[model samples]
Target: SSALRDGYRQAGVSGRVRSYLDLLAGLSDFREHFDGSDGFSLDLVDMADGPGEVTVICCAGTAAISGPHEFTRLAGALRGIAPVRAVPQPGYEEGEPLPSSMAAVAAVQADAVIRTQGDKPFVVAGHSAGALMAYALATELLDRGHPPRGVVLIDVYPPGHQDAMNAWLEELTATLFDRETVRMDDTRLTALGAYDRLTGQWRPRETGLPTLLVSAGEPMGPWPDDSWKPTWPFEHDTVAVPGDHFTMVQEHADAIARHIDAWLGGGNS
Candidate 1:
């Protein structure tokens, strides 16, 4: 038993040494991924290619780095309902002058999706900050006389609580990643930080549109209360699920998928 224990300890030490070496070698490659001159472009991840009733377009949170990859699991849950398209924020992946405000990102994505929709009935959905972008897109679609069938807001706060929302987002980052600081482009971070400004004068009122709000049971931000109530005057439905804001998307994806499926139609088989 002593010999076996000594061998196990040596193996563990060896594994950590290899991991440390790999980490050092990977640092440059990680930096290289972002060293590109290509301007930001509207990129979409086609999660499902089914000929279903509606097309669901989803937007992700601040990472803007990759929307399709982030929302893939949730989209998988909705595979039975309709096709899913995930749109990444511009600049994080491809056009220039990275969008500093949520409106800008939403406008680019909405236009891209609209051009490709080709008269298909669709719904807009987003998680966290992306939810605000989805709302903006829905409104734009309405303005263009092509309102969506519905909008899904996942673990989001209202526009009026931008300050609190931003604070929550900052806290959420730390909790989700277990890091004191996250590495991201300074310019891109600034752009993402400007999301609150876009809600400057936007009011929350009923739009007669069908809306779904999926709230996370555990608080991930610094909000004093669960403010996921009926702030917007829409034909709204709210569902509280297990997990915090981050886990609702990462760990509790199935629960969210179930909620969305029930809200939209039949269950996902």
Candidate 2:
């Protein structure tokens, strides 16, 4: 177990492996926590006073802890260009029951986006499993007659890669609990596990929106390059960034911001 944990640390995926701890410790007033009718409280971070020419709504990865504090630096980097809203996965907060399905999680996210950014021209951005959720949310927005400008996926895994992704998540969970005494939320984990299974068989309809797939340079855990290759249906600009899956968003937020700025600024919307 120690060796496995060391491997993740050396691979630069350690911060996200234990991200829940940071989530718990990092809660603050900067993010407004909203109560959802769907039995979940959602977190939203308003990085700017009002909507700008570009609005970026960030959906956190599987760790489900993407609060405002998590994207503090990224928001700073993109300051003035647009305001960022970080959307946490449902049931991430203490004592909240997990959503019944991935759709339920997506619904809450969609609701949050609508409540915070009604009718604003925005782009949806997500990291890891949140990338999938971002796509789902984009579809929701479209169905509601509010299509996003584009979609941004960072270090996303393709659908049907559930087994490999689940294995990595399970190992990371165990190591974190064993080594750091970090509290584990079994309810959320179980629901998220069910989500992984759902994604394995999930098929997204063709979306005509402009999309960007930002892949990490390094493979995650024991997975090889082919294993991490994204099989997204829509054509997108593939951007390679330094670091592994976790660090790409955690450590290299600046580079990610630059690419997003350029893409959004270059009339890709």
Candidate 3:
């Protein structure tokens, strides 16, 4: 339908891409072409409208909260300060293409941001494994010569911490799931595993942008020490806040936002 294609256009998707997807829609799944495993197409959920100079790109990676909704509270807290472009983590859900690597995942996000924000400068904020996602996004943005103003990581451990978690839990846990995972099949779980492996193999590098590492003062509910601790060994400004990893962004988004707003010189003018 033209209405469906129109939605893609309004979401900043290219016309040629829409036409191709339209042709592919005639097959089994209406969105078969759009959500194939070969490539990715996504919408940037505009969570806030604002007066700030930079847009904020956010995503969430935690137990059962990997979608754009995870940033809702944070976005509201940032209202009038910066535009929040809450993007979904690539390859984290059903029907989303499983990216070959975390680099490719960030590439899709960077592409979406460029299409929506154009020349506007931006920032990246995320929690859990999503922190590494922001890191990868900053890396790609720098490669494309459109570096972000800063990157915010909330309660994230370095790579391979999940394996360490498995060793402690004695079972598979903390795969960065969302609510949809409750009904997912082996194929979908494989997609999650693909991303997990990609994340484990990912190397962290300096993106030369200001980094803000926000840590949870309390342990995440019943999760192991390594699972919720902030052990990122990089050059960054660290701030410790109360609340566990599970409660930090949603329960205390205001405090987090105040810190972020101040760090970005929100009230300097």
Candidate 4:
């Protein structure tokens, strides 16, 4: 188990792993302790080896992917340089916690990991909504005086902002998903809409971090072209590759590593 600076103890730090279902299984009041609504434990995977100069705090894209543990493998490839911390922010599988709330949870893990992993600088990267949440946590960390060195948004949109993605959303659902909705619960979708309505105002300022916005060129692919905003923070780089949003990053791990390697000023150098 890992100990956080905020007095929260979670399973696994660095190379350790614990059984979560073993302890907290069937109790209603037990759920109230953690981030209650979504029931997500704010556990962080250290993944770093000893102490390093910089840390890459990466967020996953959309729902977890089926691409053969692509994220862990990507981290392994990047480990040739420095420590890579990939965090999963799970939310409202059941209309409870919103993405913004999940960002709050991720902030806890990020801040805790940052504190535990020595004083090395951090660069955060997120994919899709995960990217936006990373941006949110970056801003949150900055607000608390530990701003990240760089922020990478991998084929993602801005925070609190929704593209008029009705056509593409429907089409993507039709083409990609074997089931009807990628997330089956209609109530959760409605809740997300309402959640966006409320928390959209408190989003991160785009002008804050040295940012990278990677856009997937085609409309019906990894990232939606229509989702790209002209007002996005461009103090970073804007690169386009041909692939759908998910495949764009997964298929081109080398490309993603190259950009991040440069942003980090050489991953293992």
Candidate 5:
């Protein structure tokens, strides 16, 4: 649908983490890698195309990192609709280490990266834990005066999970691996935990950003199917995807892409 740009720019302290490049030239691909100490970065191939009408900030799953080539497909999809850019963040994997401030820090960096292209409405989307961060970013952006067109909360709960649990026995049953309960103390690891704690609350208070909540419909694991849960700070548009948490994003990439494309085009899809 469109051609590539000339060249892109790269940023971040670690030369390995996040780099921005132009998508049109010889190296228009992007890359993302994570390390325990140095953390991670999102390096786009072609970043020369600034002043984009839209930007897709992809939050990686639990400790999952995405490379630039993967971003190319995403970027191509986005740029095809309008001048758009994509950035993928790192950290959220089990045993993968990250600072408590990681989500907030990433949002700050993402905001800086997008602003370089000029002032434009931002639409932040995060998958799983990334979705939690996405919700956080929308709030952060509003605090900084760069409110988004809308926030896309991918396959995650709306916070306050404890109240949703049936009983200690029921909650224990959900986390149990046969007879043993998972040792993960982090509540964000489960929808119940996220809901009970309301871990991502910065948005409802700061920006009141319009939100699109995507719930998963598939059952990839023991998690119940045909169940929908909404997070806190209501005022969101909720929909159910056709797969479990992970499959939700993979299966609905095109649909998600289209929604983003429509937002960039200044029309609701």
Candidate 6:
């Protein structure tokens, strides 16, 4: 585990590491992935469209540094299952600025998604706290009559346990920092910290949309107990996929993508 951590973190840093991570990311088209016609501008990462309908819009979790890029493999896998595009939270990227609040974040996100979406239907998928953004975006879409097919949340725990959330976030941040995925002077961390303060207190509201919670087979992170073990308020399915929290996206994205493929293609209506 430590070895993988070393390799992964080492892959995200300077010269050799940056190239290594990019190489592992398969060095594909991050070429043209930004838009600004909506309420806000976003550099949405295009991960190659899938062969099927129902495009997949991914909202990456809080990572301070390159959130959507962190899911390169995951998006790559999902793109094959269904077309994939991701909304990176501002301040998490190099030059992008942070949002005022979660409300603003959601509002702008929904605006972008609404504007960018074409004729085909779509689904919103998020990891960790990005699930909150997904919910808000999906909710706004519903309110605006642009309802999505459903929502996919990967390893998202319930919020409000301040101590646990803080500890979990701090530890994860430290780990990523130690490993080089995030830099010391990066303002993305400051932005993520501010966002986390609000996101940690937020809860999942019943959106009444078809929701799928993809739990990791191996329970990881700094959760000291089962308090934040994710209990849903609405009717949904919780499927267990291999790998831990981070690895679920890193290594088992193909597996996650298959489950999403089934959920989108099969009967969830």
- Who wins the TM-score comparison? 6
Worst 10 residues of 3 by lDDT: 170-179
The stretch of ten residues in a row with the least summed lDDT in candidate 6 is 24-33
| Model 2 per-residue lDDT tens digits across residues 1-269 | 34433443443344364343333323322233333354554656676433357788887655523434556667777776677878776554565555545566666777778887777688998877678878888887887778899999887777655555555664545443443322334433433444454454556667798999987777657665466554466788888878776667667888888888878874554
- The stretch of ten residues in a row with the least summed lDDT in candidate 5 is 1-10
* lDDT by residue for model 3 (107-163), tens: 787888889888988888888778887888888888998888889998777765554
- What's the TM-score of every candidate structure? 0.70, 0.72, 0.73, 0.64, 0.55, 0.75
Name every residue pair that clashes in candidate 2.
none
The pairs that clash in candidate 6 are 50-83
Q: Give the distance in Å from residue 87's predicted Cα in candidate 2 to where it truly belongs.
A: 1.3
Evaluate all candidate structures by whole-model CA lDDT and list the values in order: 0.61, 0.64, 0.66, 0.52, 0.44, 0.66
Candidate 3 wrongly placed segments (more than 4 Å): 1-39, 62-64, 160-188, 221-228, 267-269
| 138-250: candidate 4 lDDT, tens digit per residue | 87777777788888887665543545332344444333343222332433233333333323344656545788787765666345455533125446667665566655666
Q: Which scores higher on lDDT, 2 or 3?
A: 3
How many clashing pairs does model 1 include? 8
RMSD of each: 10.9, 7.7, 11.1, 11.8, 14.7, 9.0
Candidate 3 lands at a TM-score of 0.73
Task: Give the Å shift of residue 43 in candidate 2.
Answer: 5.3
Q: Per-residue alpha-carbon lDDT of model 5 for 1-269, expressed as tens digits?
A: 11211111111122311122111111211112232235333342342133455656554433212222333444555554544444444222244323334344455445555554457555776665567666665666676677777877765644455232222223323222222212222211222222222243433354667777766665433534334343546677766656554444554555666655554554645
Q: Can you give the lDDT of residue 191 in candidate 6?
A: 54
Name the candidate, 1 or 2, with the larger TM-score value: 2
User: lDDT (0-100) at residue 81 of candidate 6?
Assistant: 64
Prediction 2 global C-alpha lDDT:
0.64
